[PDB]
Design a protein around this ligand. Structure first.
Ligand code: HEM
Ligand code: HEM
Ligand code: ZN
Ligand code: ZN
Ligand code: ZN
Ligand code: ZN
Lengths: 117, 121
């Protein structure tokens, strides 16, 4: 990475913060690779966040896992962003302990990058 | 409406924004007790996981007010809560604070839900 970009994970259907805001470290890394804009960020709870997909060419595509650190329960993910100036639609799969079982959920949210800073 | 007396009343804890069941339904024992005294309708129910459910509030006179704890059994991890209900024929808005074990940590959460009561017997 070279450029740093702050972001907020917002809800899918409103402008309030998503619960996903607690799961990513700020700011993200921003770089150009083969002419494309690549954003990288640390997922701070590797075990809970089981899958992450972001919008690319009209479909939700799995982010690239760059690095994984099971000892620290973190991983670094990277994804291509077509337009940094618009909210980016994302889809997450998660797992959490619940009343003696494992609750498996999924949700949509949006990344909003602070490009005007 | 109901005369002064004691009844059982089934209920369902529903989500705040839709009519599906809330995850809170697993935390309360059914049916609730309903006591009517001097025209005041009091609902009492057992919270079956005293440590997880840290606070509970229900709508009374247009605002969320803490429920009354009427019995607590720390050894069994349960408690009985009681609250006044103005109209049993409408969903009752509630708020919960909870603590959940979360992979060695304790997650502190909060959520809204609604109690929906069936006919008292
Ligand atoms: C036992 C644990 C959990 C329960 C019972 C739970 C329950 C729910 C429910 C009912 C919804 C609302 C869906 C709708 O719009 O209809 C929701 C949304 C959501 N949940 Fe979970 N959830 C749990 C754990 C988690 C965890 C661990 C995460 C972390 C990734 C998470 C992230 C989300 C997200 C991101 C949303 C969408 C709203 C937002 O952007 O904040 N949930 N969850
Ligand atoms: C690690 C554990 C947990 C996490 C991370 C978690 C996370 C969440 C999240 C993100 C939501 C969605 C909020 C929204 O509407 O945007 C939610 C909703 C909810 N959670 Fe949790 N939660 C956990 C455990 C539990 C537990 C143990 C309870 C039991 C009291 C619980 C009860 C609820 C309730 C009642 C809702 C609202 C949906 C419904 O009525 O079922 N959660 N939780
Ligand atoms: Zn989705
Ligand atoms: Zn005891
Ligand atoms: Zn004892
Ligand atoms: Zn609330």
């Amino acid at each position: 990475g070279i450029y740093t970009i702050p972001f907020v994970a917002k809800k899918a259907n409103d402008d309030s913060n998503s619960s996903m805001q607690n799961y990513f470290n700020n700011p993200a890394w921003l770089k150009v690779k083969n002419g494309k804009k690549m954003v990288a960020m640390t997922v701070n709870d590797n075990k809970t966040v089981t899958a992450l997909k972001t919008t690319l060419a009209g479909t939700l595509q799995d982010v690239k896992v760059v690095s994984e650190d099971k000892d620290a329960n973190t991983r670094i993910v990277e994804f291509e962003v077509e337009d940094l100036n618009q909210p980016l639609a994302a889809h997450v799969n998660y797992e959490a302990p619940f009343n003696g079982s494992v609750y498996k959920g999924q949700a949509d949210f949006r990344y909003v990058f602070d490009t005007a800073k």
